[PDB]
Amino acid sequence: DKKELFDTVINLEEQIGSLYRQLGDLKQHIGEMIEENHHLQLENKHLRKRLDDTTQQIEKF
Amino acid sequence: MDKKELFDTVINLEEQIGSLYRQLGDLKQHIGEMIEENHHLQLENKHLRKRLDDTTQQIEKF
Amino acid sequence: DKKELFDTVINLEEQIGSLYRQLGDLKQHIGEMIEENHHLQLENKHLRKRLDDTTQQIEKF
Amino acid sequence: MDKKELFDTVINLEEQIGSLYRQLGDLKQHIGEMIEENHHLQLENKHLRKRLDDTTQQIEKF
């Protein structure tokens, strides 16, 4: 009927809004993971440089 | 080593879903329109059959 | 975790597949309504023409 | 009186959703990749801190 079809369409709408919300959450968590990655790369760089410097220091004495 | 490209992909996704919402709305509008059109045609043809019945009853009585 | 995020993404996938299926049903019903419309328009045309012809017939006698 | 235009709109919608599916898949792939990358970096930095600790224990003993 009118109801049976309209409510179907609005049901689709609401499912779409739900998807959007969930994808927003996902975006947030993905962002957090990206920043995590970034910091890990920087930390890795510094620990590498530190190890190189301390290795050269030991190579001296 | 991929970084913000994937993030922009996510944003692109959210934009596409956002779009889908609006399109679904317009679809709903056109659907309702077609439903009204169908109802109008229905009752219209019913009454047309009324008048047709009456006028055929008139002619077939000369 | 790995699970908590991956299962989220696959959950989104499945919701998308669900939406697609539902939209397929909708497409079917919309098609049926369109054909219904078509037939109604044709029937309307013919009943109009019939009424015009029979009206002219009565206008004769 | 609108007809098949709306139908083509529906088809366009189904095509967009179909697309979203694939994009979500690729997204999943890149996500997994970044997760592995994060784990590698984690353990790598842990061991780097091991070696750093040991070598600092070596230097500070002259």
Author numbering:
A (entry chain A), C (entry chain A): 2 to 62
B (entry chain B), D (entry chain B): 1 to 62
What do the authors report?
The main regulatory protein YabA was also found to prevent over-initiation by inhibiting the cooperative binding of DnaA to oriC. Furthermore, YabA downregulates replication initiation as part of a multimeric complex with DnaA and DnaN that is associated with the replication factory. YabA is a small protein of 119 residues, with an unusual predicted organization composed of a leucine zipper at its N-terminus and a putative zinc-binding domain at its C-terminus. Solution studies demonstrated that YabA is a tetramer in which the monomeric CTDs are separated from the tetrameric NTDs by a flexible linker resulting in an extended conformation.
We attempted to crystallize YabA and obtained two crystal forms (form I and II, see ‘Materials and Methods’ section for details). In both cases, analysis of the unit cell contents and lattice interactions indicated that proteolysis occurred during crystallization. The structure obtained with form I crystals was refined to a final resolution of 2.7 Å with good geometry. The crystal structure of the NTD of YabA revealed an extended α-helix, four of which assemble into a helical bundle. The A'B dimer resembles a pair of tweezers assembled via tight interactions of the C-terminal elements of the two helices whose arrangement can be described as a parallel coiled-coil. Two pairs of these tweezers (AB’ and A'B) embrace each other to form the head-to-head tetramer. The tetramer thus comprises a central four-helix bundle flanked by pairs of helical extensions arranged as coiled coils. The four-helix bundle comprises residues 1–35 of the four chains with chains A and B’ running antiparallel to chains A’ and B. The interior of the bundle is formed by the close packing of the aliphatic side chains of L6, V10, L13, I17, L20, L24, L27, I31 and M34 from all four chains creating a substantial hydrophobic core. The heptadic arrangement of L6, L13, L20 and L27 gives rise to a leucine zipper-type interdigitation of side chains projecting from pairs of adjacent chains (A-A’ and B-B’). The flanking coiled-coil regions are formed by the C-terminal halves of chains A and B’ on one side of the four helical region and chains A’ and B on the other (residues 36–62). These pairs of helices, which are splayed in the four helix bundle region, converge at their C-termini where hydrophobic interactions of the side chains of M34, L41, L48, L52 and I59 with the equivalent residues in the partner chain are augmented by hydrogen bonding interactions of the side chains of N38, N45, T55 and most strikingly by reciprocal salt-bridging interactions between the side chains of E44 and R49.
